[PDB]
Amino acid sequence: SGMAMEDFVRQCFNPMIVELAEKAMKEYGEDPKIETNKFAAICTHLEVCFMYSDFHFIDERGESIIVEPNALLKHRFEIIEGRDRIMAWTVVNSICNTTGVEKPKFLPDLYDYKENRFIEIGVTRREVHIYYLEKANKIKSEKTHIHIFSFTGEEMATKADYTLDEESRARIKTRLFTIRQEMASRSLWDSFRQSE
Ligand SMILES: [Mg+2]
Ligand SMILES: [Mn+2]
């Protein structure tokens, strides 16, 4: 049964994440009570996208600052993940009008208004490098920047450009590490790793 992992997921992630995850799975006919490892991989991916975006703003004078919220500040990242297909492409289409950036052929996860590129995010239970290569092959738009995180504290990003400050990236790598430890303590980790 997947009861054990389903309960872990529901206490590990905040309720906004769990709802988004259940919405996405219902939409394409997947049931979180049954595909419990998938349930977890979706929440994790969601939690990473939101963290990546946390605290990053461009201000009135137009430069990217860190804030841990003041009305003339614009969010540094647009978030594309978490939306249904129509809305996602609506946001991407609006973004290509705003900036004039080439429209990508697949939906990526974020848009970065400072570097002016889309970001495809990846979270893997395998090794960071091979995952990166498999993603770069599959996208094959030199357009879209790729940033990969692992549960062992590692990352790999296009051109060795890690986009964010080290402190922000450490915050994400520490979160994934803690999730894996928590899973491993309950002997849920090997099943979640193996299902990838
Ligand atoms: Mg995505
Ligand atoms: Mn992604």
Curated annotation (Swiss-Prot):
Post-translational modification note: Phosphorylated on serines and threonines by host kinases, including human casein kinase II.
Ranges spanned by the short sequence motif Nuclear localization signal 1 (NLS1), renumbered to the chain = 125-140
* Resulting phenotype, I42T: RO-7 resistant, reduced affinity for Baloxavir and Baloxavir marboxil
Q: Which residues form the active site?
A: K135
Superkingdom, according to UniProt?
A: Viruses
The reported result of mutating A40V is: Reduced affinity for Baloxavir and Baloxavir marboxil
As for subcellular location, the record says: Host cytoplasm; Host nucleus
Q: Identify the residues that bind Mn(2+) 2.
A: E81, D109
Tell me the residue numbers annotated for binding Mn(2+) 1. H45, E81, D109, E120, I121
Per the entry, what this protein does is: Plays an essential role in viral RNA transcription and replication by forming the heterotrimeric polymerase complex together with PB1 and PB2 subunits. The complex transcribes viral mRNAs by using a unique mechanism called cap-snatching. It consists in the hijacking and cleavage of host capped pre-mRNAs. These short capped RNAs are then used as primers for viral mRNAs. The PB2 subunit is responsible for the binding of the 5' cap of cellular pre-mRNAs which are subsequently cleaved after 10-13 nucleotides by the PA subunit that carries the endonuclease activity.
State the oligomer form and interacting partners. Influenza RNA polymerase is composed of three subunits: PB1, PB2 and PA. Interacts (via C-terminus) with PB1 (via N-terminus).
Give the similarity note.
Belongs to the influenza viruses PA family.
The name this protein goes by in its record: Polymerase acidic protein
Q: What is the lineage of its organism?
A: Viruses, Riboviria, Orthornavirae, Negarnaviricota, Polyploviricotina
